[PDB]
Design a binder for this molecule. Structure first.
Ligand SMILES: Cc1cncc(CC(=O)N2CCC[C@H]2c2cccc(Cl)c2)c1
Ligand SMILES: Cc1cncc(CC(=O)N2CCC[C@H]2c2cccc(Cl)c2)c1
Ligand SMILES: [Br-]
Ligand SMILES: [Br-]
Ligand SMILES: [Cl-]
Ligand SMILES: [Cl-]
Ligand SMILES: [Cl-]
Ligand code: NA
Lengths: 305, 306
């Protein structure tokens, strides 16, 4: 029993973290086989960040301008190029600890684990969700750029996020490992802001199923609703629309508990309209939206890697 | 910016997890050097759990009654002994991935990372606090016994917890790595239950300091308190007494924010009286007590957002 915000074990990713320094900037890189991936803004000074021409800034750098350190060992850079907002440094040594991996781009609402890193050394691991506004509510300080997000499936690490920046509200933005930004953000020092966010409805429903699996059932009721009626309430409360694909993805949790998704939607509609009346769900006074349906099944069934 | 329940990177502990089977029971063990540590109840059947005599159950076992598997490799058991509630299986091969480590028995209020495992394989990692009633609020299913808790401050793994059981309220109990239970619990199926729990006051104050470092002061007020008056109030809300040792450990956070510890105590007394009035603190609508002062310093900026 119990239900915690659980991260994936991070060992396979720890063995990939290195430090990358270019000029006065030091950040983290991901070393897979003979390539080190990191944010391309490592090549910029503060003045360059105001209006960077990355192609011209990179033409001016040589391989020797990048110092890459894996623990106490210097890896020699033998080539460099950019793929979108990611710099790729070819090194003379392949990482002997490279796991089986893929680069995957995720959608808003999906969760992943972050291995927060400073100076190429892993510091901590936590789980989070990609918000509907494409930001992440991470925990990052200066020097954390290049820290990555991932999921595991069996023995394969799926890397999905590389950290690039903090926005004025203290939330974070970054790219996939092919260097494509999540959200309408750029790697330039200009006015940028997180857009208005919404709550991930399918995830709140998944977490209400986790609460029923754990014995918290006070919010269940005799009513059902329709997908149309529920979506009119979701829009009013700044919740994402629930689609038939979301109803299908909640299928396994609905089958395990015996509670139809539209029956659980009637519970959520009443919680949105009335509040919790001084009660909690799984120890929380807020409706939690950073567990996907698969996260609940994994945790409640003890899936291992 | 941001503030999350942050666990230590688990790799150094993942390389120590193994599966131990005795009879029909399979659970996890921790392989360090040439010893595998696991809960001694691996030798019990369900009926043995009502009134087990562990000395009598163990004398009937040979080394070859223990099967230990590290990934796809079987490790040969060459000796066994019991230390309190932990079985120590000597194996013929030392773990080549043994990290620098120590064993530490912690106090209530201290936090640690848990690597929850099944069949010797990791499922996930999360942070826990040792509650004042000597339980932990984990996430563990049958088969998770032998999963461990640890901290990794300064590249050395300090193992502080080994999981043994779930109590009737769904909370968890276990031992240190010398096999002594935290709390009054026993590895026997008795009517034992978690005592009434209390809130870890020093941790709530540390987390209010984290909120100020991260830029929020709305909950402060113009008052101060004596330590005794604060404790008389706090105990009425089932908060643990705050000691002078707790006030000392909050010193660095007080220095960084310019808020005297007894002035943050006056803020907490007012938050217990008023609630948050629709606001949140670090994303929470409830007062959080599973971050220690050391955990706040570990995670937060050393520069306050004034
Ligand atoms: C506190 C913190 C936490 N996470 C990351 C950072 C890094 C950050 O925001 N940087 C670094 C260069 C200047 C700035 C930036 C500005 C604009 C676009 C980008 Cl990609 C980057 C800081
Ligand atoms: C769901 C779950 C989560 N965590 C661990 C367990 C294991 C558990 O509670 N066991 C196993 C043997 C019988 C029982 C027990 C009973 C009494 C004392 C001890 Cl040490 C152990 C179960
Ligand atoms: Br301690
Ligand atoms: Br909450
Ligand atoms: Cl940086
Ligand atoms: Cl009703
Ligand atoms: Cl078990
Ligand atoms: Na209903």
């Amino acid at each position: 029993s119990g239900f915690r915000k659980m991260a994936f074990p991070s060992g396979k990713v720890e063995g990939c973290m290195v430090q990358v320094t270019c000029g006065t900037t030091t950040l983290n890189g991901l070393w897979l086989d003979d390539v080190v991936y990191c944010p391309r803004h490592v090549i910029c000074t503060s003045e360059d960040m105001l209006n960077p021409n990355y192609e011209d800034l990179l033409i001016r750098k040589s391989n020797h301008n990048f110092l890459v350190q894996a623990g106490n060992v210097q890896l020699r850079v033998i080539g460099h190029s950019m793929q979108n907002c990611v710099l790729k440094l070819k090194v003379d040594t392949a990482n002997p600890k490279t796991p089986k991996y893929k680069f995957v781009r995720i959608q808003p609402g999906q969760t992943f684990s972050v291995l927060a890193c400073y100076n190429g050394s892993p510091s901590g691991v936590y789980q989070c969700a990609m918000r509907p506004n494409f930001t992440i509510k991470g925990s990052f300080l200066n020097g954390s750029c290049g820290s990555v997000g991932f999921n595991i499936d069996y023995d394969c690490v799926s890397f999905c996020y590389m950290h690039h920046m903090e926005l004025p509200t203290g939330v974070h933005a970054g790219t996939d490992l092919e260097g494509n930004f999540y959200g309408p953000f750029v790697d330039r020092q200009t006015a940028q802001a997180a857009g208005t966010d919404t709550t991930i409805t399918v995830n709140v429903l998944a977490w209400l199923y986790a609460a029923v699996i754990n014995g918290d059932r006070w919010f269940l009721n005799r009513f059902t609703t329709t997908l149309n009626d529920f979506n009119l309430v979701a829009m009013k409360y700044n919740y994402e629309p629930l689609t038939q694909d979301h109803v299908d993805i909640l299928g396994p949790l609905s089958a395990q508990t015996g509670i139809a998704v539209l029956d659980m939607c009637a519970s959520l509609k009443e919680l949105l309209q009335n509040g919790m009346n001084g009660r909690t769900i799984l120890g929380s006074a807020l409706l939690e939206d950073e567990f996907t349906p698969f996260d609940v099944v994994r945790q409640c069934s003890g899936v291992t890697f």
